[PDB]
Amino acid sequence: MRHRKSGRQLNRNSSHRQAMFRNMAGSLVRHEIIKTTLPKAKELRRVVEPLITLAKTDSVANRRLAFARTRDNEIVAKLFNELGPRFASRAGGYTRILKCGFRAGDNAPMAYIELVDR
Amino acid sequence: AVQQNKPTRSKRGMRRSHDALTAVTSLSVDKTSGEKHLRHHITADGYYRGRKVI
Amino acid sequence: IGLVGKKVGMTRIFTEDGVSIPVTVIEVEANRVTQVKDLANDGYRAIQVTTGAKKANRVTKPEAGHFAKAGVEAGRGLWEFRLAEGEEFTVGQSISVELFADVKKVDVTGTSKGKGFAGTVKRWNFRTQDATHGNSLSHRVPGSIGQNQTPGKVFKGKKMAGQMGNERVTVQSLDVVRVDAERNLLLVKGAVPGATGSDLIVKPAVK
Amino acid sequence: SNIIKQLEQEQMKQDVPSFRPGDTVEVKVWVVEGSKKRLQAFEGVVIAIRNRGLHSAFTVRKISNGEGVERVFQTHSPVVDSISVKRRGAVRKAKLYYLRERTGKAARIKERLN
Amino acid sequence: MIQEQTMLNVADNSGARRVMCIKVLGGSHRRYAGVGDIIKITIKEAIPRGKVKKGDVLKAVVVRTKKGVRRPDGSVIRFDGNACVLLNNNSEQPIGTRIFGPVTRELRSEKFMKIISLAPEVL
RNA sequence: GAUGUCGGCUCAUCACAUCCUGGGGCUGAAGUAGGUCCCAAGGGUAUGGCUGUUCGCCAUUUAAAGUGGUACGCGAGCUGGGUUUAGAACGUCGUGAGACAGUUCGGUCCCUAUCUGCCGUGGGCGCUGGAGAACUGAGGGGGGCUGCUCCUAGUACGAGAGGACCGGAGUGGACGCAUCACUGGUGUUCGGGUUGUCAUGCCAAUGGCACUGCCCGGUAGCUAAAUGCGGAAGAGAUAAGUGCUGAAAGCAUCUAAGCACGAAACUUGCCCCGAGAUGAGUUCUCCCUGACCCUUUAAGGGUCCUGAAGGAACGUUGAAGACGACGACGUUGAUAGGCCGGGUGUGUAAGCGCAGCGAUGCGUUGAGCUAACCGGUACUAAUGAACCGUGAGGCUUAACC
RNA sequence: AAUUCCUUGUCGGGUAAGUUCCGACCUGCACGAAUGGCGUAAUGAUGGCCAGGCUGUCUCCACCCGAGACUCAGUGAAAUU
RNA sequence: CACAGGUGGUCAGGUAGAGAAUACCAAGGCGCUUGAGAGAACUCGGGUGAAGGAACUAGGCAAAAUGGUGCCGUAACUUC
RNA sequence: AGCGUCGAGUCGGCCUGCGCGGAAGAU
RNA sequence: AGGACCGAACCGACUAAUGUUGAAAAAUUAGCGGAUGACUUGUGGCUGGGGGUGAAAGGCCAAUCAAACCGGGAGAUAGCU
Numbered sequence A: 001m002r003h004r005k006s007g008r009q010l011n012r013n014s015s016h017r018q019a020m021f022r023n024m025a026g027s028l029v030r031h032e033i034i035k036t037t038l039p040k041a042k043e044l045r046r047v048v049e050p051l052i053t054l055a056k057t058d059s060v061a062n063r064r065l066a067f068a069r070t071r072d073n074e075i076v077a078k079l080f081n082e083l084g085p086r087f088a089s090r091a092g093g094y095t096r097i098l099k100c101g102f103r104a105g106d107n108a109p110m111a112y113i114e115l116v117d118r
Numbered sequence B: 001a002v003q004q005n006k007p008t009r010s011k012r013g014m015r016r017s018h019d020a021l022t023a024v025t026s027l028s029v030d031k032t033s034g035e036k037h038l039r040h041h042i043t044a045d046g047y048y049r050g051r052k053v054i
Numbered sequence C: 001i002g003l004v005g006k007k008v009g010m011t012r013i014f015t016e017d018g019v020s021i022p023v024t025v026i027e028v029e030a031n032r033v034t035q036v037k038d039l040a041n042d043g044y045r046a047i048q049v050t051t052g053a054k055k056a057n058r059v060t061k062p063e064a065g066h067f068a069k070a071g072v073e074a075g076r077g078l079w080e081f082r083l084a085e086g087e088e089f090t091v092g093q094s095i096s097v098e099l100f101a102d103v104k105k106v107d108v109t110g111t112s113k114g115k116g117f118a119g120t121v122k123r124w125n126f127r128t129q130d131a132t133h134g135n136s137l138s139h140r141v142p143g144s145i146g147q148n149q150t151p152g153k154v155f156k157g158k159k160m161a162g163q164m165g166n167e168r169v170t171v172q173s174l175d176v177v178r179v180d181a182e183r184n185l186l187l188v189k190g191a192v193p194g195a196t197g198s199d200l201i202v203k204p205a206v207k
Numbered sequence D: 001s002n003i004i005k006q007l008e009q010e011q012m013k014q015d016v017p018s019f020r021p022g023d024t025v026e027v028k029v030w031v032v033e034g035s036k037k038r039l040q041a042f043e044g045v046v047i048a049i050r051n052r053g054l055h056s057a058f059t060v061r062k063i064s065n066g067e068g069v070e071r072v073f074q075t076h077s078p079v080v081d082s083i084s085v086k087r088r089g090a091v092r093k094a095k096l097y098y099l100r101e102r103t104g105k106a107a108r109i110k111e112r113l114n
Numbered sequence E: 001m002i003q004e005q006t007m008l009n010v011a012d013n014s015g016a017r018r019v020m021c022i023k024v025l026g027g028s029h030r031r032y033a034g035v036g037d038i039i040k041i042t043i044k045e046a047i048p049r050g051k052v053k054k055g056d057v058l059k060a061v062v063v064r065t066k067k068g069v070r071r072p073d074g075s076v077i078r079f080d081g082n083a084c085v086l087l088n089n090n091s092e093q094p095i096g097t098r099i100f101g102p103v104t105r106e107l108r109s110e111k112f113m114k115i116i117s118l119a120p121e122v123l
Numbered sequence F: 001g002a003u004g005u006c007g008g009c010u011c012a013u014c015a016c017a018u019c020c021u022g023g024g025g026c027u028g029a030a031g032u033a034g035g036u037c038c039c040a041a042g043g044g045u046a047u048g049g050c051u052g053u054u055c056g057c058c059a060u061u062u063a064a065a066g067u068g069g070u071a072c073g074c075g076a077g078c079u080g081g082g083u084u085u086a087g088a089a090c091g092u093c094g095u096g097a098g099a100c101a102g103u104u105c106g107g108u109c110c111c112u113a114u115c116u117g118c119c120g121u122g123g124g125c126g127c128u129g130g131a132g133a134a135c136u137g138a139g140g141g142g143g144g145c146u147g148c149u150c151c152u153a154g155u156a157c158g159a160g161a162g163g164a165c166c167g168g169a170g171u172g173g174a175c176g177c178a179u180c181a182c183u184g185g186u187g188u189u190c191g192g193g194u195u196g197u198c199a200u201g202c203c204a205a206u207g208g209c210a211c212u213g214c215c216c217g218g219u220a221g222c223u224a225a226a227u228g229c230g231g232a233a234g235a236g237a238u239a240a241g242u243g244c245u246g247a248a249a250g251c252a253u254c255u256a257a258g259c260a261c262g263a264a265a266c267u268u269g270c271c272c273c274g275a276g277a278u279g280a281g282u283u284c285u286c287c288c289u290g291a292c293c294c295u296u297u298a299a300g301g302g303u304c305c306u307g308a309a310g311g312a313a314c315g316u317u318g319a320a321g322a323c324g325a326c327g328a329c330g331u332u333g334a335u336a337g338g339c340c341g342g343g344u345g346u347g348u349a350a351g352c353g354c355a356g357c358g359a360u361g362c363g364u365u366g367a368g369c370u371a372a373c374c375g376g377u378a379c380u381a382a383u384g385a386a387c388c389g390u391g392a393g394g395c396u397u398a399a400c401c
Numbered sequence G: 001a002a003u004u005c006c007u008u009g010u011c012g013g014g015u016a017a018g019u020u021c022c023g024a025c026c027u028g029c030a031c032g033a034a035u036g037g038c039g040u041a042a043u044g045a046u047g048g049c050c051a052g053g054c055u056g057u058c059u060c061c062a063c064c065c066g067a068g069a070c071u072c073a074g075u076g077a078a079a080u081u
Numbered sequence H: 001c002a003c004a005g006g007u008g009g010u011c012a013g014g015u016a017g018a019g020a021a022u023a024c025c026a027a028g029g030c031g032c033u034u035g036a037g038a039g040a041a042c043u044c045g046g047g048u049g050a051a052g053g054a055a056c057u058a059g060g061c062a063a064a065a066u067g068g069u070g071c072c073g074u075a076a077c078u079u080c
Numbered sequence I: 001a002g003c004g005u006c007g008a009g010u011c012g013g014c015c016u017g018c019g020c021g022g023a024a025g026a027u
Numbered sequence J: 001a002g003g004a005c006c007g008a009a010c011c012g013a014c015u016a017a018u019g020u021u022g023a024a025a026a027a028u029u030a031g032c033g034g035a036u037g038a039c040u041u042g043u044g045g046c047u048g049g050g051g052g053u054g055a056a057a058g059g060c061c062a063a064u065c066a067a068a069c070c071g072g073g074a075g076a077u078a079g080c081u
């Protein structure tokens, strides 16, 4: 049973998932659009959108908390300097998921995830 | 555990009565480009609900 | 008859004597009689009720007409209650939780929580075999499922793994702790079947 | 949800005094011998608090005639007549289960100066 | 929550110090004795010159448990150890003249009023 | 041209020659408690010490610890202690190789399930126009155990000792179902402490790795040890048994006619499934009211027009789930994510300031952070369509209009 | 008794209860003196027995983390008959 | 077999460490030639567990536990 | 037989036809 | 000093689980023994089938051992299927 539980395991251990979503969150803040599997994209919103929320309030504390959760000062800089101010009036929903069919190699359901004002 | 008797071509076909693939019900027609696409998916030319997305 | 309510959840009532009564809170909103069945037309005596409220668009024309005949707003479903010799109601009459004001004990019927595909340990309280002492791949497995050549088959009703819960369950003779017309509340002592928010049928206790 | 809130709210004692883990509380509880109602004191260290609305509880540890005794009180129960904080303890933790493995000098809690 | 093989401390001056539960009395397949339940015990350790000897088989009433006792408001009382009071096999009256440490109000019947009376505290 | 063999474990299923509970006759049955026989298979029917043991003896329970059948039930379900391979030794026999219905130490247990069966779960078509609901209940399954205490009543009975029937109330054991409010477990998705090391330029602060590095707490969920509930009463027909009236047989006789009673067995009552119940049932509601041609003319085959109710599909999903299925929701929208507020948990972040030689302490500060929770909120994603399903539904006979 | 059939010999010890174990007895079915007798510190992945600690071995299982099992796409066996 | 096996010699960085053990790293090398989902039973490999603590079992099998350095201290018996 | 009375059968063997009890088992 | 002690490499193989159409025709995982010696290892050499070699298990002698393998007598013989 998994009654009321949140989170996908994605055939990973917990350390792998955290690392992967950290790398993928970075990738999305850099490029602003990435293509991934639909369940990875759906999960990425639960990581990314809190980072942008945190970026709305530019403090030293929040920068270190962002750096903790990304380990990339370049990504932290873009969150606080660009995305945080970009999304200031918007109340969540900083990303959108658009389905884009199926991967050639494994028939994985793919999707774009992008920042909404990109 | 293994069969004591060779199953028939009849029984083979009966089991495969459920293996038939289902066609896509219908394709959706984009607002702008007029490209047919899988519903809720972006078009081949990067339109979705009339917007150039990629 | 009974009434259809919703499982709000569980809490407690502290009494003056320092007893903590575990309660299930049942929201029993007005049950509106949609259809009265009788011996002439239907062959048996019953009322069909609805309760709650349904979106105007998700009510189908067949369902909308059934509610329209009664002169009742659409609710979230339809349920029947068999009438005794004494009883009579009319189509459109509302019945409230005050029906239970003098009722001391209730039977509560719900849909039990779904456990999915359950093994024999969980489903039937089978004993596990040895965790150690040489046991090969047979810790929670069922063991023997029959005899030998006599009878050379497994008997029907054999306890095996499969779907558990997500089924109709009655719990009988639960004490009514409180009735509250104002807030549409029936409080019953102890647990009842189903998840929070699930439909419950509450009737006066048969025993 | 909101229904249970209102059912629960009206049973909650409005005069529960403030206390923390490490504090020595005296809990006065009603004790019944047929009809004879009297208050028995239970004084010891608060070792755990469950903050949970009406379902609030706290665990008080004392050594009682050579024997350690924990009582888990239900905070809004009418059984508990009153709670007086006797001393304020200075601990780090929310739960002081480590005191179960300590006696005498080891089990002493530094007073919270405020 | 005492079962066969559970070792209990002794809350009296019978002379026993450690006793082992060898039977939970009062029903077929009965698993557990809690506070107020009579168990069959064997004495594993005794003082030199008590009223009881090591290896004696007799009864006891459980008076303190680590599992503890629930009260009607939902409260719990847990003790740091399991303890019992030795009873005569036939009579089921306490062998000792005194009771050591706290007992609970669960013992208040007609049965265990000597224990209630002799105990330094009832909870 | 192989049907694995003792004992255990797991899971059973049947018989009744009944161990307990239920009913009853006789007693060398006062009561209590026994003895013996009859009825009764509904349910129930020990844990340990020793031994490979079954068994047995022993300890301590229990209302009781039943007897058998089922390949001495069950190794394509587990075990491998016994026993019957190869090693080795003792006693014993034999000149010896070796041997023992002697002993002793050691000694590989394979199989992905095609069919039947069984437990679950779908797809198809049917049920006669199509559709959405609510049902009826043929039939099937589950359940059915029992202690102790108190009252009746120290009453009946008895010389006393002791000590009831019948009836009633409470509280347990075992078992089952549900549930998570409480008490707890878990809680690698929350918070914190800490060892070694590597890194982020360095300090400070953080992250990785070391079983989640090791630990301490703990939210939701799941859950038992937690706490609610259950076994019934009642009804019908009976078993052994007890009778009434009553002849055959002037009498007698429970039986031949007739009538009454009588048990956990039986049929119901309680719970669950259930119209594929092809004998395919019922009730309520909704929907479709065009034209035309062809010909072996018939319950026939097309063209154009039309496309309903509803369904499905797709999407966001769920306390539903292996997959199907089932439930919610799709902008006329709270379906999910986010976001906001709260709660909960952890336990006073960082930064800066202050005290100290310093570790560190204190202030700001119950701070910071906080998952699955609660209340909200259209910010993001749930799209206009398209698709399936049609166009008033056979004949006969009857009744009626 | 690595030997004793009768045999769970008998008595003592340990356990609530000990066909095993330890100590005795001698009634050695069928020990016995280099196919050595009796004893023996130390040693042993050696046989038997007991205790403390320890625990999911068990009472009686619960939850969680991973790999399969399950679904989709690609590839694609087997014994048997 | 592009197979968890087997195969002699040589070289020997940093921090911690008695160490060529072990943990984390450097130089250097690699992620192991099906992937994607889901988060049932059951199996495998692990983590934690209320109360009890060998009651399990042929047998504590397996697991749990102990675990370092210095110092104090240490019995029967003994071939010393 | 029921009982002094009341009014026609009544008593127990033999043989024999057909029945009855004796008669409990495991999907 | 030591067929001394603890413990890696190295050499072994006591226990358990897994695996048993294996990753593997003997392994993997967690534990386990020896680890200056009657130790271990590379290269080459020698012993040949009623023969070898054997700290002895009928062990080993190319995945073969109470008489190796290959070819031959050879279509042995088969009152058996």
Ligand SMILES: [K+]
Pocket: none
């Ligand atoms: K049987």
Ligand SMILES: [K+]
Pocket: none
């Ligand atoms: K009798």
Ligand SMILES: [K+]
Pocket: F041, F042
């Ligand atoms: K029976």
Ligand SMILES: [K+]
Pocket: F071
């Ligand atoms: K057989």
Ligand SMILES: [K+]
Pocket: F075
């Ligand atoms: K067997």
Ligand SMILES: [K+]
Pocket: F076
């Ligand atoms: K078989």
Ligand SMILES: [K+]
Pocket: none
């Ligand atoms: K098997």
Ligand SMILES: [K+]
Pocket: F115, F116
């Ligand atoms: K078959």
Ligand SMILES: [K+]
Pocket: F180
């Ligand atoms: K709970």
Ligand SMILES: [K+]
Pocket: none
């Ligand atoms: K919990």
Ligand SMILES: [K+]
Pocket: none
């Ligand atoms: K670190």
Ligand SMILES: [K+]
Pocket: F275, F280
């Ligand atoms: K039907």
Ligand SMILES: [K+]
Pocket: F121, F325
């Ligand atoms: K289903």
Ligand SMILES: [K+]
Pocket: none
């Ligand atoms: K939302």
Ligand SMILES: [K+]
Pocket: F348
């Ligand atoms: K501070």
Ligand SMILES: [K+]
Pocket: F349
């Ligand atoms: K601070």
